[PDB]
């Protein structure tokens, strides 16, 4: 079986390159961030513009939802993160502590902590309630491209331009694992699998890899796309067929069969690099977003 993703909506609004798109855990909303310093909220099913959330002083590289869909956290070149109440649009807290651009962010599954990665080569853990920095991890020797909590929040995974993925004990800050394969290209993205057994990592040699992080073994590689320059997100699609989804620097969305590693679909439409993709939590819907020559977000739907 292959999917049949077809374009349903194109979402215009951002005035510069879009940096990230994320579906709310409750399925209602899509959040986008951009180089234009704005966060936008859109209906997940119709693509209907909902509102703009404003306050960062420079471009935003990432945005992420709390697990109850009530909050967002964003990571900006202004060297802050901001925690937002989505319903009111209020900036609840500004997280100050990184010494350089903040590139990536996530809540833990409980949503009492935030993890952040920066050009300053650190990973930081923040208290959501107080907005204060709890721990700074001297994590990497180059900018940190992605950070993510595992299923129970006991671990953090980080990736970096230094060529490493690392696994951190949330509680102690100890480095529990370093992962790298036979070459040392920059690692541009990483996340845990939905079941928490694997990490999915992108490297800037046109390769996605699925790792068993506990055994430290690469189990699958996904290739065929173009990724040598940008920090492009990748996803597990789990609502229908079990796929891997990623943008690409040839302006397409790539979808692979997770088990077989074969390309099952390529989505054509964007006019620039597809920097970010996201998969809806319950319906077979992909959101894709593109860089400065395009500026749009697209919603695609499949029967499986």
């Amino acid at each position: 079986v292959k999917p049949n993703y077809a374009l349903k909506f194109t979402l215009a609004g951002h005035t510069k390159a879009v940096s990230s798109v994320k579906f709310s855990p409750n399925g209602e909303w899509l959040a986008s961030s951009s180089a234009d310093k704005l966060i936008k909220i859109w209906g997940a099913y119709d693509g209907k513009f909902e509102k703009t959330i404003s306050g960062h002083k420079l471009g935003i590289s990432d945005v992420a939802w709390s697990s109850d869909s009530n909050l967002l956290v964003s990571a900006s070149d202004d060297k802050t993160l901001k925690i937002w109440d989505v319903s009111s649009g209020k900036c609840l807290k500004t997280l100050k502590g990184h010494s350089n651009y903040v590139f990536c962010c996530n809540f833990n599954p409980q949503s009492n902590l935030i993890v952040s990665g920066s050009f300053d080569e650190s990973v930081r853990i923040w208290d959501v309630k107080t907005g204060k920095c709890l721990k700074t991890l001297p994590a990497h020797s180059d900018p940190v491209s992605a950070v993510h909590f595992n299923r129970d929040g006991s671990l953090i995974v980080s990736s970096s331009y230094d060529g490493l993925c690392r696994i951190w004990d949330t509680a102690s800050g100890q480095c529990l694992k370093t992962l790298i394969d036979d070459d040392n290209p920059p690692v541009s993205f990483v996340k845990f699998s939905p079941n928490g057994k694997y990490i999915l990592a992108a490297t800037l040699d046109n390769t996605l890899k699925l790792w068993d992080y506990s055994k430290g073994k690469c189990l699958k590689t996904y290739t065929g796309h173009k990724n040598e320059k940008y920090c492009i997100f990748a996803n597990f699609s789990v609502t229908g067929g079990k796929w891997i989804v990623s943008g690409s620097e040839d302006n397409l969305v790539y979808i692979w069969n997770l088990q077989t590693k074969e390309i099952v679909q390529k989505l054509q439409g964007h006019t620039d690099v597809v920097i970010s993709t996201a998969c809806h939590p319950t319906e077979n819907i992909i959101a894709s977003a593109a860089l400065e020559n395009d500026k749009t977000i697209k919603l695609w739907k499949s029967d499986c």
Partner: peptide, 5 residues
């Protein structure tokens, strides 16, 4: 930001 490299 992410939108430049």
């Amino acid at each position: 930001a992410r939108t430049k490299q």
